[PDB]
Structures are given as structure tokens and as C-alpha cells.
Amino acid sequence: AEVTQLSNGIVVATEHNPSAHTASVGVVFGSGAANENPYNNGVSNLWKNIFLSKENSAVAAKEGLALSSNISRDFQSYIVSSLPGSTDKSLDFLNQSFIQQKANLLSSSNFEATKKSVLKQVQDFEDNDHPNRVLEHLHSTAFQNTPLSLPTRGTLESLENLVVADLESFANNHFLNSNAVVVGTGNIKHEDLVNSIESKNLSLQTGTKPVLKKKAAFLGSEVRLRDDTLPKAWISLAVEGEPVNSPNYFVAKLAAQIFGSYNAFEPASRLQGIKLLDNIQEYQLCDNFNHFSLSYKDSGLWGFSTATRNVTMIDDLIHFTLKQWNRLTISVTDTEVERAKSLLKLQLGQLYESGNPVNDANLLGAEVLIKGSKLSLGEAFKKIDAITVKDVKAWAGKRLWDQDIAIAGTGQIEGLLDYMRIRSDMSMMRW
Amino acid sequence: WGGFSVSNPTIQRFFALHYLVPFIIAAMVIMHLMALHIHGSSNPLGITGNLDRIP
Ligand code: HEC
């Protein structure tokens, strides 16, 4: 329940939990796919893949350490998990790979075998993971010609034309000290870790700052990846959401909980206290849907994603869903808000407190990099419970009502009507 | 004519008929739209419109 963080030469952030059997240690850099270019796009993902290379991974396996990495938009992270006792040997492997082997991982035999793996990896994604593929393209069109548009896994064309020098160039511009935070989760104490860190000196590229860019911006638009050979239609639609560290950060997430997620095959899901379900179940407008409030450093996306085999009624799916969202500005009820608060706490809890320290590190790391600290789970609940119907209405009237949208879809989307028809539904006629 | 030449009977029946026909035309227009609906409009290229329609 304690979020301890101190700075000496490097910023150290930890969160202890004695009941945890293992401990995870790692470095989280304040730069991700949002820092790349259209041409070196996929370099971060490539780094992650060599860090988990058979060679580097075997060295950690002998020592009894497990490797894990995650490439996001605003950040990047390299994590090593171990037993509570080997909390020192994780730091040896961390330093040995980011300073000593910052040239042994980049061999012309390791790099090629890895490049061939991320190529089959990113290709498999585009060929089969339609829901995530669609969600990735949603960011692509919504934030076109802006940092948030670049996909995390990179594109096949920028990937196959990438070389060892590109990795180095990126590493020497972002893997800096002022653009880093060392994180530790599990059971180890803050004072326990900071000592092993403040022990080993050496700055290594100190005072150096990463390159700057241009601010991210939402552009109402769409990308339609029609493919009549797929057995379904997958669509994602959203408005400009909230950036992390926004006053309405929670109002937005609550609003998404009101409509929540659905799965037509799960008996219990068909019974949720969601008004939209009365409309969509009559003719079974979809197999599933899920709302989200994605937040990043400069912006975010608020909307929903859905999958359906009812290809001749896609317009009803979109129409009923948008009519429900209209409600947030004009008629959302106290009980809908209250139901959302309870369910938001339950999901926010299950995230911030899972039985896995690697998840804790990513959540902690990502937060401290943006606001310099982490809001305690109990602090969130105070903010969540304080939200009134009046708040949700003021938010919706600014973010949802008669606002541009961004759309992306693949599969049998002939039935997804034109942009203007969808856009017109972002409001209602009144006297 | 209703007689020996164009006279009163003629003009009175022509007004009655002038009032009637517009309604028969209206019924024919509906039949015209019905035939139009089953195949839809054509376009300036003279080819199929099935690959790209807008409401
Ligand atoms: C002798 C020919 C002809 C006459 C007279 C005619 N139509 Fe048409 N109409 C057509 C044809 C053929 C089309 C299909 C055009 C196409 O899609 O290429 C058509 C299409 C239409 C359309 C669709 C839009 C358009 O302009 O293509 C409407 C509406 C329509 N007609 C209304 C009428 C009405 C109302 C009348 C008369 C009161 C009328 N038509 C008289 C031949 C005719």
C-alpha cells in the first residue's frame, strides 16, 4: 500500500508487499513507439526481442532469473523476475546487459535470427489478430501524422529495412538516465534496493536529453480495411479521450464502465445492468463489444470496439450504441453512475493488485514517469466515489456531444455506413 | 365530342378527365419507382454500382 520513490543520481521507485513469493526488478524508459519515426518504426519492439533472445535469456535462466519486456506508446520496459533472495543478482544481469553487453547482444548472427522472428511475429498479427489489428489502426487514423499514430510492433516495411545502427542510434538517444526510472516490485524494501544501486557508481551518458517533437492531435477520420473473406466484422470507434493526469481521467473511465463490455455467449453477461443490452439482444447485433478509456501522455481515446456476424444489421449496432452514448449528456441516471462506480473499483482493484509483480512494475513505472508519483488505490476510490451525474454530463457534453469520431474496421464491413451517418448520431434533434 | 362538334358536353367532359388523369399518372409513377427499386439506378460509367454505394 506504500509508494516509495527517491532520487540520488537515478530515480528509484518501489512498492513492497511481503506476502509476495517473488520480486521483480527492471528499468522503465520514458520513451516508446510514440518517440519513433515512420521510418525506424519498430526499433523499440526489436530491442525488446533481443533482450529476450535465446542467448541473453539462457544466461538469466542458469542464474534462475526470468525475463520480461513491454513496448508501449509513451514508455518502454525491461524486467527481470527472481526470488526475494536473489534481488541482487537481478541488478547484475540488468547492468551486464545495458552496459557490458550493449554490444554483445547486437551481433550479426543474433540480430538476423531475431529480425526474422519479429517479422514472422508482426506478420502473424496483421494476418490474424483482427480485433487488436483494428484497434491499432484506430490509433493510426485518429492520430495520423502525429506520435500516437505509430503502431507499437512497428510496420513490416520499416522493420525489414532496419539495421544494427538504428538500434544503437535509438538506444543512445532514449536509453538515457534522465529518461529512465528503475522500478522494483515484489517484496523487497525500498532501502534494500536503493543501496545496491547507490553502491555501484558510474553515470554513463549523464546530462544527455532525448530529442523533442510535435504535440499529438486527434483528427476525426476513418480507415476501412474491408475483407469479405473474413467471417465477421470487427470495428472500433472513438472520440478524443483524456490524457493521463487529466481532471476528468476518472470521469472518462467511469463513463466507459456504464456501457462496459459484453459477450453474447456468456449467460451472466446478457444479464448486466446495461440499457444498451435491451436493444442489441433482440436481433443479436453482435457477438461482443467493450468500451474503453485509453489514456496517454498527450491525449487519449474514448469509445468502443465490437465484433459481429450479423453483417446486414451493423447499422443498428452502431445506431443503438451511439444513442446510448447520447444519454450521458442528457439523461444518465443516478443508479447507472452508482453501478459504474462499484464496477470501476472492482476492475481498478483487480489491475493494481494482481498476483503478479511484473504487472505491478509496468503500472508503477508508467505512472511515475509521467507525474513523478503514483496515486494510491485508496486515493483513486475517493475520487471515483466523488463523481456526480452532473460531472458525467459536463464531461460528455464536451467530449461526446456533436464531436468528431475516428473509425476503423476490417472483415465484412459493407454494412458499416458512411462517416457522416455515424457522425450525425453523435447527437439528437431538439426543439 | 358528345355531339355534332366541340361544344359544351366536350369541355365539361375534358375538365372531368383533366382532373382524373393526374391521379393515374401518380399511380404509374409508383409503378415506375417500384421497377427502379429492384435494380437501383444506373451510373455514368455504365457499369455495376454494387462495389461502392452511399445512402
Ligand atoms: C420514357 C422514359 C421515362 C419517363 C417519361 C420517365 N422516366 Fe423516370 N426513369 C426512367 C429510367 C429509364 C430511369 C433509370 C435511369 C438510370 O438509373 O439510369 C428512371 C429513373 C427515375 C428516377 C430516379 C432518379 C433519376 O432521375 O434517374 C426517378 C425518381 C424517376 N425516374 C421519376 C420519374 C417521374 C416522377 C416521371 C414522370 C412524371 C418519370 N420518371 C418519367 C425513364 C423514364
How would you write A360-390 as a 3-class SS string? HHHHHHHHHHHHCCCCCHHHHHHHHHCCCHH
| Ligand 1 center from residue B42 Cα (angstroms) | 11
Query: With b meaning 16 or more CB within 10 Å and e meaning fewer, what string describes A172-186?
Result: ebbbbbebbbbbbbb
Give the contacts of A75 (CB within 8 A, at least 6 positions apart). A28, A29, A30, A31, A32, A365, A366, A369
With CA atoms as reference, report the closest residue to A130 among A232, A33, A45, A222: A232
Asked whether A411 and A234 are in contact (CB, 8 A), the reply is yes
**CA A144, CA A397: separation in Å to the nearest integer?**
25
Distance from CA of A316 to the nearest CA of B (A): 15
Torsion on CA atoms A195, A197, A198, A204, rounded to nearest 10: 180
Paired residues of A234 in beta bridges: A307, A410
Domains present along chain A, CATH in parentheses: 1-202 (3.30.830.10), 209-431 (3.30.830.10)
Chain A contact present for B55, CB below 8 A: yes
**CA A226, CA A123: separation in Å to the nearest integer?**
18
Length, in residues, of chain A: 431
With CA atoms as reference, report the closest residue to A87 among A155, A171, A140, A21: A21
Residues of B in contact with A421 (CB under 8 A): 55
Residue A300's H or E segment, with its range, is strand A300-308
| Ligand 1 center from residue B32 Cα (angstroms) | 7
Q: Please work out whether the CB of residue B42 comes within 6 Å of at least one atom of ligand 1.
A: yes
Chain A contact present for B54, CB below 8 A: yes
Cell digits of residue A381: 476510490
With CA atoms as reference, report the closest residue to A264 among A222, A293, A307, A234: A307
With CA atoms as reference, report the closest residue to A94 among A65, A73, A74, A70: A65
Distance from CA of A40 to the nearest CA of B (A): 36
CB pairs under 8 A between A and B: 4
Asked whether A328 and A322 are in contact (CB, 8 A), the reply is no
Residues of B in contact with A417 (CB under 8 A): 55
Cell digits of residue B47: 457499369
Asked whether A210 and A174 are in contact (CB, 8 A), the reply is yes
Distance from CA of B31 to the nearest CA of A (A): 27
In degrees, rounded to 5, the angle at the alpha carbon of residue A333 between the alpha carbons of residues A330 and A334 is 135
Sheet of A406-411: strand order equals A221-226, A406-411, A233-240, A300-308, A288-295, A261-263
C-beta atoms surrounding A346 within 10 Å: 11
DSSP category for residue A98: I
Cell digits of residue A328: 450521458
